[PDB]
Design an enzyme around this catalytic site. Structure first.
Site, short mmCIF file in Angstrom:
data_model
loop_
_atom_site.label_atom_id
_atom_site.label_comp_id
_atom_site.label_asym_id
_atom_site.label_seq_id
_atom_site.Cartn_x
_atom_site.Cartn_y
_atom_site.Cartn_z
N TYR A 72 11.29 -47.86 -84.18
CA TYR A 72 11.53 -47.62 -85.60
C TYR A 72 10.23 -47.60 -86.38
O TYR A 72 9.28 -48.30 -86.04
CB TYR A 72 12.46 -48.68 -86.19
CG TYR A 72 13.93 -48.37 -86.03
CD1 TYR A 72 14.77 -48.35 -87.13
CD2 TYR A 72 14.46 -48.06 -84.78
CE1 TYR A 72 16.11 -48.03 -87.00
CE2 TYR A 72 15.80 -47.74 -84.63
CZ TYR A 72 16.62 -47.72 -85.74
OH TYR A 72 17.94 -47.34 -85.62
N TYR A 123 19.04 -42.65 -91.91
CA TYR A 123 19.14 -41.21 -92.23
C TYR A 123 20.00 -40.89 -93.44
O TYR A 123 19.59 -40.10 -94.29
CB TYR A 123 19.63 -40.39 -91.02
CG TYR A 123 18.55 -40.13 -89.99
CD1 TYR A 123 17.32 -39.59 -90.36
CD2 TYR A 123 18.75 -40.48 -88.66
CE1 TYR A 123 16.31 -39.40 -89.43
CE2 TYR A 123 17.75 -40.30 -87.72
CZ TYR A 123 16.53 -39.76 -88.12
OH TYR A 123 15.54 -39.61 -87.18
N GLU A 176 11.66 -39.64 -82.93
CA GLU A 176 12.72 -38.95 -82.20
C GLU A 176 12.21 -38.08 -81.06
O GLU A 176 12.86 -37.98 -80.02
CB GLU A 176 13.58 -38.12 -83.15
CG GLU A 176 14.25 -38.91 -84.27
CD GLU A 176 15.29 -39.93 -83.79
OE1 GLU A 176 15.45 -40.18 -82.57
OE2 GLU A 176 15.97 -40.51 -84.67
N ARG A 179 11.27 -40.32 -78.08
CA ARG A 179 12.45 -40.81 -77.40
C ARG A 179 13.10 -39.72 -76.55
O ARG A 179 13.49 -39.97 -75.41
CB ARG A 179 13.47 -41.34 -78.42
CG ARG A 179 13.03 -42.62 -79.11
CD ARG A 179 14.13 -43.27 -79.93
NE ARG A 179 14.22 -42.80 -81.31
CZ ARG A 179 14.05 -43.57 -82.38
NH1 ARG A 179 13.80 -44.86 -82.25
NH2 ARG A 179 14.12 -43.04 -83.58
N1 LIG Z 1 12.77 -45.46 -89.55
C1 LIG Z 1 13.29 -45.06 -88.40
N2 LIG Z 1 12.45 -44.83 -87.36
C2 LIG Z 1 12.98 -44.44 -86.19
N3 LIG Z 1 14.25 -44.23 -85.86
C3 LIG Z 1 15.06 -44.46 -86.91
N4 LIG Z 1 16.43 -44.36 -86.95
C4 LIG Z 1 16.79 -44.69 -88.23
N5 LIG Z 1 15.78 -45.00 -89.01
C5 LIG Z 1 14.67 -44.86 -88.18
#
Ligand SMILES: Nc1ncnc2[nH]cnc12
Length: 262
Positions: A72, A123, A176, A179
């Site tokens: 995150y 999100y 994202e 990952r």
């Molecule tokens: N700040 C963030 N960083 C990474 N994945 C996330 N999923 C939701 N918020 C996020």
């Protein structure tokens, strides 16, 4: 804490691939892995963080702070005013982690300035601040990311919309992508232009936790139970085995306990 530097203002698909490769190798746990997929570390492992310096055009930079445990984005910093370092912590960061963000991003206690991100990192919150119903309406792209860095880096005030758009693009193109191999490839296929994230990139983002648990808990490549995902067209996609989802996944969320490592 190690920082990964990525030049956004001048790159190639090869450089982007290397960047994500370094980040994945920095974030992942040295030995934790299930079915050949490396897994993020336990929250007790040090370091607990990893920085990502995004070098945009016209000497505009922004450094992202990521938690290794779940990748995150906890907050970011930007060179500000004369020799100041302005840190921005996500509203959803609590306790000691809030001091960690401040001291990790701006190591110089004497020159750091604060400008909190007055909303969380979810999100739906980002989408709401961006003024859209879905992040699918927000185009991703290298020049877009570069452009958003320039609207925030070193700029005194900036709208919550402007900030949310940057965060949406940065989180997707950084966290994202690291990952998911699929998301990385989507960026590479449209590397020279702007594009709308498809039903599969967005679904993958939203189901990463479930996927990681299913793969960690899978027996001989068999998911504990059928996993309902969605493909690029937007059609339902029932995955029954690790072999069916693995190609799209680069990193697993930390999941406690033992699993079949390879
Ligand atoms: N700040 C963030 N960083 C990474 N994945 C996330 N999923 C939701 N918020 C996020």
């Amino acid at each position: 804490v190690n920082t990964i530097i990525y030049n956004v203002g001048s790159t190639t698909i090869s450089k982007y691939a290397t960047f994500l490769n370094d980040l994945r190798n920095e974030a992942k746990d040295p030995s934790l892995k299930c079915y050949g997929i490396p897994m993020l570390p336990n929250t007790n492992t040090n370091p607990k963080y990893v920085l990502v310096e995004l070098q945009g055009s016209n000497k505009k930079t922004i450094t992202l702070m990521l938690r290794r445990n779940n990748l995150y984005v906890m907050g970011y910093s930007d060179p500000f005013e004369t020799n100041k370092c302005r840190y921005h912590i996500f509203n959803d960061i609590s306790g000691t982690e809030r001091q960690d963000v401040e001291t990790t991003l701006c190591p110089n206690a004497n020159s750091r300035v604060s400008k909190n991100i007055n909303f969380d990192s979810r999100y739906p919150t980002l989408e709401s601040k961006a003024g859209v119903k879905s992040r699918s309406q927000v185009q991703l792209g290298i020049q877009i990311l570069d452009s958003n860095i320039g609207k925030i880096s070193g700029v005194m005030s900036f709208t919550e919309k402007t900030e949310a758009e940057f965060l949406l693009v940065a989180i997707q193109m950084v966290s994202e992508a690291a990952r998911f191999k699929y998301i990385e490839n989507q960026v590479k296929t449209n590397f020279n232009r702007a594009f709308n994230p498809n039903p599969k990139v967005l679904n993958l983002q939203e189901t990463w936790g479930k996927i990681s648990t299913a793969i960690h808990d899978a027996k001989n490549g068999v998911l504990p139970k059928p996993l309902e995902l969605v493909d690029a067209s937007g059609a339902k996609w029932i995955v029954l085995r690790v072999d069916e989802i693995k190609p799209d996944v680069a990193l697993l969320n930390y999941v406690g306990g033992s699993c079949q490592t390879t």
